[PDB]
Design a protein around this nucleic acid. Sequence first.
DNA 1: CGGCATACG
DNA 2: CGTAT
DNA 3: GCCG
Length: 326
Amino acid sequence: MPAYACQRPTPLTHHNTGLSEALEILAEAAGFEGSEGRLLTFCRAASVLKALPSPVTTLSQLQGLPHFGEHSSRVVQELLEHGVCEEVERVRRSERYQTMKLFTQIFGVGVKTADRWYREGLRTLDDLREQPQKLTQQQKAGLQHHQDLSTPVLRSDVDALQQVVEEAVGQALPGATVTLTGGFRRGKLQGHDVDFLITHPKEGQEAGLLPRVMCRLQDQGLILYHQHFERSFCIFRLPQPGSWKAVRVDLVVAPVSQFPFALLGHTGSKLFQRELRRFSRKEKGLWLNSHGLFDPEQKTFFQAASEEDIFRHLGLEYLPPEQRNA
DNA sequence: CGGCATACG
DNA sequence: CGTAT
DNA sequence: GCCG
Ligand SMILES: Cc1cn([C@H]2C[C@H](O)[C@@H](COP(=O)(O)OP(=O)(O)OP(=O)(O)O)O2)c(=O)[nH]c1=O
Ligand SMILES: [Mg+2]
Ligand SMILES: [Mg+2]
Ligand SMILES: [Mg+2]
Ligand SMILES: [Mg+2]
Ligand code: NA
């Protein structure tokens, strides 16, 4: 089992679901306490289990696996022996965890804001609605739409949104293209949002594109919220039987020269990309981001025509998006 | 021990 | 700070 | 929390 998540296939569904979910609770809780290192370790340990070819049944099967030390091994041991890990269950029922989860789930509220509100004694969404003086316009929108945004986005919703985005993109700039990214590109059947990447085959034509796209979607009455650039974080009005629902949609524009890097970055998973960037820098001495791959000794960028090129330039076996579910 | 991914709004 | 459930 |  290799040590980096980008060195191994990780499918969306696997053979250690309960064990990985428990470790991910501990990772999430660490994040709520600002322990970024412990979050990373628990996420990595969970991801190792997702990559195994069969269920862990005995503690000896953890020997030699990367990212399993005393703490993660103990969590697994308790789950194998008793079906529950006491630490995990204490986290789950804690007022701190439940409130931090509720608050950070709001669009426009991160850990820092959630923690401040927690220390002020706030606990529920209605607590926040009572004091709108403390909310940014983005938070107000996230709070008004919280119920719809907490409802999973389905793959049928994605096809509908992609058509409306393509229509607006086509008027804004003929020839521009729309690619589905994020979790749905990795094969997820549901999501918290829909992610799209937009480019144009003629380098430079994509400049100024996103404002033109957003104005056109707004004119069609489809935008319930946006910030008004090359990235937009929107709430869309999506038709439903006899009604509609609010859906989070992210749009990114990239020049075609950068498209493979942007596609790779925005397809994720989040952990996969962190691991890939760590691997690039630490093992290969190259600096990877969603725009390119930089050799800091030669002071040159690697031209890529495909995701396949990027994996080759890092010396990694290619993984399709469905195997990037780290 | 230091390190832990990265950029835009 | 938020995007970053 | 774990790795090198
Ligand atoms: C949140 C986040 C995302 N990303 C990249 C990889 C993600 O897969 C991609 C899209 O982000 P998200 O839309 O937040 O996540 P997702 O689509 O993978 O899953 P879902 O929406 O169902 O919750 O952007 C990062 O590189 N770093 C981050 O911190
Ligand atoms: Mg997404
Ligand atoms: Mg998104
Ligand atoms: Mg230390
Ligand atoms: Mg997200
Ligand atoms: Na949030």
